[PDB]
Design a protein around this ligand. Structure first.
Ligand code: IHP
Ligand code: MG
Lengths: 149, 154, 763, 112, 505, 42, 273
């Protein structure tokens, strides 16, 4: 009876990733109740020499990049070297969800999904000044503009 | 249905025929073009009339050469890209199910399997599932088998 | 158990740089690089040292026996079948040390053996090798060549000098091929004794749009683009750049570029000239193309718009030339009414119904519309045409199809190659069978004569075909000049015959000049074949001429004073056919009655076929299968998607096109609000970060509509890169994850069945 | 990238009209003028295997151009380091080569 | 498995007693063989058992005009009728008036026109046959989206120029002989570096092989030793003690990123897999799925007509052949991190908003606003779900004067046919006689397994290399092999004809 | 050197039209279709 | 569901200015039309039409100035370079007949007098073949006319091209000429074979023919198998020019075989980048 089972599983494999043909497991209940949880923070990373040399090679390719971002009207904004990106980040004009483009990409991506852009931006002075600007300038203004209108 | 199950599908057989025809036709056309270029070179050099130099230059035109298709591999003549399937590693990682079974069996039992018992093992294993497991690149469930073996346990 | 929820609390990798599985190997794709040949020999040495000592290092060094093993045992390239071995000598020693004297070299070197220097020079050994390949004497006793001219070259005749290795390898006896000829002359050096031919040098692949390829990696099809110049080919050296170009004719390009060529996505505006492979009469000043670009051409999906005429095309393009499914609109009444000061809502209310009723959806072949020369009904008609044959032909050709499949399934590879050779020759003989048996004749008084037709030709070939080209039906192609219709305005007689006679004069002068220049050199001394006959492709004529002369009366008189072209005969073929009838038990009266029933009932196939066994890869269709309505709707939908992604490259801040072409009501330049830190005049709501959220959007409803649409597109981009760790049941990602887990479980079950079969077989 | 920085004098002569700014915007595949015959210029041992070109990349903002001298050969890693090996020549082959390589440059992928 | 549209084309209640491999090509092959078998049986059974079309417009035109109402048009008609009866009318045609209005149709064209009139007015496997031929034509259309040959150069076709510019308009880096020649040359200065080779003999085939390199002091041993040194120094260059400062700086740099951005190799593989399955799910929502030839498109092309609407990596800087032995670029190599410039991520918080909407847009802005093209497309999808005889006389006698009955025409033709032909004959005999003298030089001094030309031998060997079987040895093809292959082909054709004749009794 | 070559696109289009309606076994439509194409050239 | 998968948005940047109808200072995205931007200016009520900002034509001097800056180039200037003109009008050689390679036919199978009354009207398919043969003679008279071929170096320009395929090409097409091929002297021999048969070559031919039992031998004249050694190696001169080969003896299986008796300048490479 294993031969019938093997032919049924082979024909199941033949149409498994056909996205228009429904499957019984597509809406089956999970074993435990869902209780939608977050991925735990890894807190300990040991890099291989392969990863070190790949990061160094990517840093070499990205040394001379001029960046551009889009605003809320889908209009591209001005030529951005790294210090201009740091000024815009500290001021709160851009954040990690802003669409960016540079050399090495075909299309516009959010900043967190572009590799090594956030480690280039987040200098300790930048992180401290971004926290100061967020805490004592923009959030009281947001609460004020929520109460006034 | 008996003819299709015997393997006499017209799509595969005619594809093989067209690939062999493309290879032979490319070689024969290149040799005839070589003879014509030789003749015009000799008529220009030992004869002294430069119209045959211009004919030799017109025969040697890049637009004509890549229009004839003599520089592209003949797989491209039948609509297929040239592949290098032996360059990819053959290990445990993303192998086919039969091949990965041979490597599991070859890990222990320290005797590397010769051709006849490997042929018997793959023949019996394919006989279990009715021959419906994917064997080619055009078979559906190639993607499913590739997804199913992409995770390394630890 | 669940692969998609492994615990990430310790992330560690153990991989070295350089990685040995990527470094210590030569790829098959690296054919055509000589350093790869050096590396392959060194990698063979590494493997030999590993199996001897467990490391990639010798105990002493490279020995002499490693060099012998590398030369003889490692590379063992495949030859033809060996010649019949000789057991006795066919020559006799005349002076001292005339000839070389009559377990292998590697295992003689291993068991103790030194290699000391010989006194003979390299040219003597290569001469001996050429004499053994030709199996004939190539020099006489005095040192002068027999098969080669021994005089110095006539520099005033246009000749130069040649060494014997070059001459005796380029002119050779036809049972010697180029590779053993190279081996006999000791052609060894990887960098200087080898050159690539023009037809065999490596080139990047052409892939077109890149669809329909075989994926080496099924999860990553883009890896199959790595040998091409496709815009999504991985790692093309220089990066793709944001180009803003203003041309001298004021054509402008904006978008992605490769080595300064428009080759990805973008927008081209047309000035006084043209661009993107469009014809010069198609564009006017201010027209626009948006969409995909390859190698400077409009290629892929896109939109063409003209403000001046109002024409809009959405659809497919091939090499700038409108090929495939498309939609055409006429927006001229709306544009015309907008130019005369009507506000756009009132103009749309006046013109929308007449614009919607005139939408056209069509198939285009190469810049021209299909559907007016019965293109949609051709396939069906050909099917009906195959039903108008007599029944014997239909039954016979279906039986032929089945038998051809069955015998190709059983063939050897060599049989398959010879079968395709025979099929190619039968294809060629339908256009030029030759004139076998009718090249030369032997009239009265002996006297071998040539056989010519009514136009003086001895062959059906004409060399003017190489210049002009011919069609599928044998008609000659277009020339340098010509009337528009050659049936409506034929060439006037008295001019046709005059130019035909002067053409025969040109042919006579051609034969005279070619016989002067090439007619004296000898190619085949046994048959009298010369270079003019050989290079014109007339060796068939020469074999017939030798046969006809040898049976002429002058031929037998010359022969006793001194004292063809077919593989099978007619009688043998008739005997084989008559033998092959009586195996099946079919008398000729059976053929008579089957022809009687065939006679009582008194290009075969699909012209748009994909895999025809009988082809020359040269017959063109001038049509395609016409698009149905859902295909046109799908390609318009996808082209609008492409046009949005293409318009994202439209205003490069401080680019040349924006600096020169963004103007006010007069011709004055404006300060566009594109600077990255300043949001003037109450536009701080446009900032994409937290500063934009705390500022007030103005109360124009259309602006808020536009902002909602932009946010929708941004969320669609976001969802393709950011995923949930624990997706809720009932969502799309939950369905995807369930299918991934099912795929792993099924593959593990199939693997367990092969382990069970292996344990059963090995018992 | 002004047009007069690239303007040549007198068609048949391919040299630049203005030699005072000829250093600006040079590609790595541009020829070096120190290899003209009769010139007793400096010795440049880092360029001895690429002597016909100006074989270094010192490019600016978005002006990098690469043609058969790749980015990796000009400025990455052991490719760049190995191309400049004539800087480090001093100015038998059977046994001492492997012994010196084992003692001096040890690596476990070969020697272990 | 066959679809609903196919299932209503073939006659029903057919039982399938066997399991066919999954895929569209096997189903279509089985249906195609079924149509073939049914047509063969029908024609065998039919063989074992026992119309002048005229033109409306031309007939109306020639009935409209009248001769005979006066002597002028009558005489014009008489003159035309005399000449036309002499040269225009063929003997099997019975009247000039009948063939001037006859529509000159061939037999198959008038049969097909009768059939199409019968279709427009109102068998077994004919609609199924038509359907299968349509999907064959659609496959030929689908070849435009991939690699293809362009072997016909015609006026107006821009496609071969695009192919030439795609193959040669860009520089692709690959270290060929041409590239090694352009980088560094020997710069000899003291003569040639290479010299004539010295054969060696050993002290304890047809060709003498070179033994000059059987020494450790030669050129080849130097090249191998140089390659070995380069490998050792490339490995030593990346040892950890040599890279230590770099290891500090990168350890600072990569620690400026949030901790949740670090991923395992299994996690990045899983995210890559989810990306392309999400693309397939979105491809199932297009209008392409309502095509009749959809799923022929899907198994040959995919769900879209553009590669940029599929899932790909951002690797568009750096050179592939410089990186090949350093970093893995595809998952089908070992379990490594691949070199990319983009990173998919897991969400690290709960998305309370849509993350890109302004706060003031969250009060009833769910538009789906539509423009002109959207509305036209929606409308289309909802629709989816006297004086003649004199002129002819003048034209006919003028053409008869031009192309027949012209003595200058006849003069040019007869010089062509006689004089220049005998001149070409004389030169051909002269060349013949020179060739015969060259042959008689060998004939005076004189007392099957033949191989083919070099082109034929090379063509055979290259196809045997592409046969897909384990590579055999090179062969030298003769004429006996060729005549054997020809006889085998003709035997197969004659035997299948005799099988059909045996069925016809 | 002024050797003249003409661009012959319209002649090629007429010949393609004849081939297309000869493949469809309807050459009875030839004069009307070719005539309307020549009229739309004007 | 909507027809559009993505939303179509206007993608224009904003600027500030005066409105003249609202009479107000306004932020807007209304830019001047591309149908007249760059051609004119209005700095007064009167209008300036500019005289040369788009080039509207081209001659040889201005083509030489703007050669690498145009988006197109036409046949009108490129006639006068022969390689460019071959790119515009290539040879139309198709459907090869392989007359060099096909020498046999598998099966074998004179001023006649004709009266007009015995002669049938010809079928329309062979009528077409006769017209085709006459057209090939007319084509030879137009294209390969030797009275023009003899004076083509110095008095006229007669080059072999096909029909003109395009009128306009993209400007970077000349990049397909960048990777040059070899000169034909480096592919083929520059020396003829023998023009007469001397005594020793007749003896060598008879010895070879005796070894093959009168089947003889066939020969082939091909391209080079290798480049020539004297451009990269020091070769021994052998100044007498006599060879004396060095080998083992000829084999069989009287009938005994006998021998018949009686500083450096550098090139300019083409295969370079
Ligand atoms: O030249 P001849 O040997 O005298 O041939 C003529 C004659 O030829 P010409 O009129 O061209 O000189 C006719 O041949 P056609 O004109 O028909 O070609 C003629 O035929 P009619 O008398 O029927 O017109 C007939 O030929 P045949 O022998 O076929 O009857 C006849 O030859 P005779 O000398 O035998 O009369
Ligand atoms: Mg065909």
């Amino acid at each position: 009876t294993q031969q019938e089972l093997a032919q049924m599983e082979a024909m199941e494999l033949a149409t498994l990733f056909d996205m228009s043909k429904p499957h019984p497991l597509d809406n089956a209940a999970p074993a435990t109740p869902w209780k939608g949880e977050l991925r735990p923070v890894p807190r300990k990373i040991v890099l291989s020499p392969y990863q070190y040399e790949m990061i160094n090679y990517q840093r070499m390719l990205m040394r001379k990049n001029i960046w551009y971002y889009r605003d809320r009207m889908n209009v591209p904004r001005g030529p951005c070297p790294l210090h201009v990106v740091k000024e815009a980040w500290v001021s709160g004009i851009v954040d990690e969800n802003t669409l960016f483009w540079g050399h090495g990409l075909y299309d516009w991506l959010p900043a967190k999904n572009i590799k090594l852009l956030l480690p280039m931006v987040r200098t300790p002075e930048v992180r401290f000044a971004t926290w100061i600007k967020r805490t004592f300038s923009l959030k009281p203004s947001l609460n004020r503009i929520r109460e006034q209108r | 249905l008996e003819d299709v199950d015997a393997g006499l599908v017209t799509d595969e057989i005619n594809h093989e025929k067209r690939l062999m025809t493309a290879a032979q036709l490319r070689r024969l056309e290149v040799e005839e073009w070589d003879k014509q270029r030789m003749k015009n070179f000799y008529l220009a050099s030992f004869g002294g009339l430069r119209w045959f130099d211009q004919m030799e230059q017109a025969l040697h035109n890049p637009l004509f050469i890549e229009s004839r298709g003599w520089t592209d591999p003949v797989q491209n003549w039948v609509g297929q890209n040239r592949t290098y399937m032996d360059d990819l590693p053959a290990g445990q990682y993303m192998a086919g199910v039969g091949n990965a079974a041979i490597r599991i069996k070859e890990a222990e039992l320290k005797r590397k399997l010769t051709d006849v018992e490997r042929a018997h093992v793959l023949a019996r294993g394919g006989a279990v599932a009715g021959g419906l497991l994917p064997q080619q690149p055009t078979d559906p469930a190639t993607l499913a088998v590739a997804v199913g073996g992409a995770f390394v346990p630890s | 158990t669940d692969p998609l929820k492994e615990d990430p609390t310790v992330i560690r990798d153990e991989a070295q740089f350089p990685e040995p599985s990527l470094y210590f190997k030569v790829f098959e794709s690296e054919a055509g690089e000589p350093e790869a040949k050096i590396r392959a020999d060194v990698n063979k040495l590494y493997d030999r040292w590993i199996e001897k000592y467990g490391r990639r290092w010798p105990e002493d060094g490279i020995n002499t026996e490693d060099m012998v093993w590398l030369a003889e045992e490692a590379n063992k390239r495949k030859r033809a079948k060996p010649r019949p071995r000789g057991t006795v000598a066919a020559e006799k020693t005349e002076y001292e040390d005339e000839f070389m004297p009559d377990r292998t070299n590697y295992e003689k070197t291993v068991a103790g053996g030194k290699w000391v220097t010989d006194e003979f020079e390299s040219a003597d050994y290569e001469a001996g090798n050429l004499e053994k390949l030709w199996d004939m004497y190539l020099w006489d006793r005095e040192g002068k060549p027999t098969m080669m001219p021994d005089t110095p070259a006539a520099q005033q005749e246009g000749e130069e000098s040649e060494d014997f290795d070059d001459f005796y390898t380029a002119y050779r006896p036809r049972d010697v091929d180029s590779e053993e000829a190279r081996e006999a002359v000791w052609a060894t050096d990887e960098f200087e004794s080898d050159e690539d031919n023009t037809e065999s040098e490596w080139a990047p692949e052409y892939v077109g749009a890149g669809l329909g390829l075989v994926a080496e990696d099924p999860l990553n099809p883009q890896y199959s683009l790595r040998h091409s110049n496709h815009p999504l080919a991985p790692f093309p050296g220089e990066p793709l750049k944001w180009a803003s170009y203003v041309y001298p004719d004021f054509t402008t390009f904006e978008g992605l570029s490769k080595q300064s060529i428009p080759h990805g996505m973008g927008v081209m505006t047309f000035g006084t000239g043209t661009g993107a492979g469009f014809a010069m009469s198609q564009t006017r000043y201010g027209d626009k193309y948006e969409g995909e670009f390859q190698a400077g051409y409009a290629h892929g999906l896109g939109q063409f718009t003209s403000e001046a005429s109002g024409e809009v095309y959405i659809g497919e393009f091939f090499a700038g030339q409108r090929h495939g499914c498309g939609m055409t609109l006429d927006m001229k009444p709306y544009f015309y009414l907008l130019e005369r000061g009507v506000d756009p809502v009132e103009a749309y209310r006046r013109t929308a119904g007449a614009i919607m009723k005139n939408v056209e959806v069509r198939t285009w072949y190469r810049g021209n519309k299909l559907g007016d020369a019965k293109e949609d009904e051709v396939v069906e008609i050909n099917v009906l045409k195959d039903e108008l044959d007599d029944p014997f032909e239909i039954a016979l050709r279906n039986s032929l199809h089945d038998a051809k499949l069955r015998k190709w399934k059983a063939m050897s590879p060599q049989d398959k190659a010879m079968d395709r050779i025979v099929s190619i020759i039968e294809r060629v003989q339908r256009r030029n069978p030759g004139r076998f048996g009718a090249y030369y004749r032997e009239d009265e008084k002996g006297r071998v004569r040539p056989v010519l037709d009514s136009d003086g030709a001895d062959t059906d070939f004409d060399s003017v075909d190489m210049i002009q080209g011919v069609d599928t039906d044998g008609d000659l192609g277009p020339g340098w000049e010509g009337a528009t219709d050659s049936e409506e305005n034929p060439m006037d007689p008295r001019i046709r015959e005059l130019m035909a006679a002067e053409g025969m004069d040109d042919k006579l002068e051609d034969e005279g000049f070619k016989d002067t220049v090439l007619g004296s050199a000898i190619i085949n001394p046994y048959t009298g074949l010369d270079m003019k006959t050989y290079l014109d492709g007339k060796e068939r004529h020469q074999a017939e001429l030798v046969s006809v002369y040898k049976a002429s009366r002058e031929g037998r008189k010359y022969l006793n004073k001194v004292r063809p072209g077919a593989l099978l005969s007619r009688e043998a073929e008739d005997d084989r056919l008559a033998r092959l009838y009586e195996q099946a038990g079919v008398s000729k009266e059976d053929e008579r009655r089957v022809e009687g029933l065939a006679a009582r009932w008194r290009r075969p196939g699909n012209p748009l076929a994909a895999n025809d066994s009988d082809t020359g890869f040269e017959t063109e269709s001038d049509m395609m299968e016409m698009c149905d309505i859902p295909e046109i709707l799908g390609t318009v939908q996808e082209a609008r998607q492409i046009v949005e992604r293409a318009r994202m490259w439209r205003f490069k801040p401080y680019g040349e096109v924006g600096l020169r072409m963004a103007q006010d009501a007069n011709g004055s330049p404006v300060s566009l609000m594109q600077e990255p830190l300043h949001y003037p005049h109450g536009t701080k709501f446009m900032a994409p970060g937290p500063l934009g959220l705390c500022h007030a959007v103005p109360d124009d409803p259309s602006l808020r509509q536009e902002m909602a649409k932009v946010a929708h597109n941004y969320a669609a981009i976001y969802r393709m890169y950011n995923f949930d760790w624990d997706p809720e049941p009932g969502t799309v990602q939950y369905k995807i994850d369930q299918r991934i887990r099912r795929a792993q479980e099924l593959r593990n079950n199939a693997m367990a069945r092969y382990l069970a079969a292996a344990d059963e077989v090995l018992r | 990238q002004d047009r007069i920085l690239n303007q040549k004098k007198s068609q048949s002569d391919p040299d630049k009209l203005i030699t005072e700014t000829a250093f600006l915007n040079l590609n790595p595949t541009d020829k070096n003028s120190r290899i003209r015959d009769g010139v007793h210029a400096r010795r440049e041992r880092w360029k001895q295997r690429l002597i016909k070109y100006q074989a270094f990349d010192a490019s600016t903002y978005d002006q990098g151009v690469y043609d058969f001298l790749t980015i990796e050969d000009l400025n990455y890693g052991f490719d760049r380091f190995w191309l400049r090996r004539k800087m480090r020549n001093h100015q038998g082959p059977r046994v001492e080569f492997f012994r010196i390589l084992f003692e001096q440059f040890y690596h476990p992928n070969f020697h272990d | 498995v066959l679809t609903n549209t196919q299932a209503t084309l073939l006659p029903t209640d057919l039982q399938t007693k066997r399991t066919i491999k999954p895929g569209l090509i096997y189903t279509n092959s089985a249906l195609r063989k079924f149509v073939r078998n049914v047509n063969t049986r029908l024609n065998l059974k039919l063989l074992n058992s026992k119309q002048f079309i005229y033109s409306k417009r031309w007939k109306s035109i020639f009935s409209k005009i009248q001769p005979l109402q006066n002597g002028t048009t009558r005489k014009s008609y008489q003159l035309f009728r005399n000449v036309a009866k002499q040269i225009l009318v063929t003997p099997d045609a019975k009247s000039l008036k009948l063939i001037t209005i006859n529509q000159k149709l061939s037999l198959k064209e008038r049969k097909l026109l009768e059939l199409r009139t019968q279709y427009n007015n109102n068998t077994l496997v004919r609609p199924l046959n038509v359907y299968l031929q349509k999907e064959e034509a659609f496959k030929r259309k689908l070849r435009y989206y991939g690699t293809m040959p362009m072997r016909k150069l015609t006026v107006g076709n821009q496609a071969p120029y695009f192919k030439a510019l795609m193959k040669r308009g860009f520089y692709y880096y690959k270290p060929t002989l041409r590239w090694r020649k352009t980088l560094y040359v020997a710069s000899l200065r003291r003569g040639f570096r290479k010299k004539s080779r010295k054969q060696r003999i050993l002290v304890m085939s047809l060709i003498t092989k070179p033994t000059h390199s059987y020494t450790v002091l030669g050129k080849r041993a130097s090249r191998y030793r140089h390659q070995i040194y380069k490998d050792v120094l490339q490995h030593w260059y990346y040892t950890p003690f040599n890279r230590l400062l770099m290891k500090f700086d990168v350890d600072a740099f990569i620690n400026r990123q949030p901790k949740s951005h670090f991923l395992t190799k299994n996690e990045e593989r899983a995210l890559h897999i989810r990306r392309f399955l999400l693309s397939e799910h979105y491809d199932t929502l297009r209008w392409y799925t309502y095509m009749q030839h959809y799923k022929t498109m899907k198994t040959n092309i995919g769900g879209t007509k553009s590669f940029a609407n599929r899932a790909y990596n951002q690797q568009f800087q750096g050179t592939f052949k410089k990186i090949r032995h350093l970093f893995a670029i595809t998952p089908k190599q070992g379990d490594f991190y691949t070199l990319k410039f983009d990173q998919p991520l897991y969400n690290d918080n709960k998305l309370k908003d849509n993350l890109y909407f302004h706060e003031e847009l969250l009060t009833d802005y769910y538009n789906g606003t539509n423009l002109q093209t959207n509305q036209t497309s929606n409308i289309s999808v909802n629709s989816t779900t006297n004086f003649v005889y004199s002129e002819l006389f003048v034209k006919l006698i003028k053409e008869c004067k031009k192309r027949i009955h012209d003595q200058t025409f006849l003069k040019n033709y007869i010089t062509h046919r006689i004089e220049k032909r005998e001149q070409l004959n004389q030169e051909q005999t002269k060349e013949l006689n020179k060739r015969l003298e060259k042959l008689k030089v060998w004939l005076n001094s004189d007392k099957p397994d033949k191989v083919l030309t070099t082109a034929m031998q090379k063509a055979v060997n290259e196809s045997i290399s592409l046969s897909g079987i384990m590579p055999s040895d090179k062969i030298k093809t003769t004429y006996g092999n060729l005549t054997n292959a020809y006889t085998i082909k003709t035997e197969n054709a004659i035997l299948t004809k005799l099988n059909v004749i045996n069925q016809l009794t | 050197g002024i050797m003249p070559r003409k661009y012959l696109i319209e002649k090629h289009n007429i010949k393609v039209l004849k081939k297309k309606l000869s493949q469809a076994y309807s050459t009875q439509q030839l004069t009307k279709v070719v005539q309307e194409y020549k009229n739309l050239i004007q | 569901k909507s027809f559009d998968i993505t939303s179509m948005t206007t993608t224009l940047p904003f600027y500030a200015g005066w409105d003249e109808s609202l009479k107000k200072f306004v932020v807007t995205n209304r830019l001047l039309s591309r149908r007249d931007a760059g051609l004119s200016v209005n700095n007064n009520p009167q209008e300036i039409n500019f005289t040369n900002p788009p080039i509207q034509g081209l001659n040889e001097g201005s083509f030489l100035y703007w050669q690498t800056e145009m988006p197109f180039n036409s046949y009108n200037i490129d006639q006068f370079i022969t390689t460019n003109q071959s790119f515009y009008a290539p040879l139309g050689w198709r459907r090869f007949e392989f007359r060099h390679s096909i020498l046999k036919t598998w099966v074998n199978n004179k001023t006649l007098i004709i009266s007009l009354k015995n002669l049938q009207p010809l079928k329309s398919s062979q009528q077409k073949q006769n017209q085709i043969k006459t057209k090939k003679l007319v084509a030879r008279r137009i294209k390969k006319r030797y009275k023009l071929l003899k004076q083509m170096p110095n008095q006229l320009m007669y080059s072999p091209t096909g029909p003109l395929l395009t009128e306009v090409l993209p400007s970077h097409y000349i990049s397909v000429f960048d990777q040059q091929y070899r000169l034909p002297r480096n592919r083929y021999l520059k020396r003829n074979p023998l023009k007469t048969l001397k005594k020793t070559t007749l003896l060598a031919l008879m010895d070879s023919s005796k070894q093959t039992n009168g089947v003889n031998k066939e020969f082939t004249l091909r391209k080079r198998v290798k480049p020539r050694r004297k451009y990269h190696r020091k070769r021994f001169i052998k100044k007498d020019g006599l060879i004396f080969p060095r080998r083992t003896k000829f084999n069989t299986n009287d009938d005994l075989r006998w021998r018949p008796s009686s500083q450096l300048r550098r090139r300019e490479f083409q295969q370079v980048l």
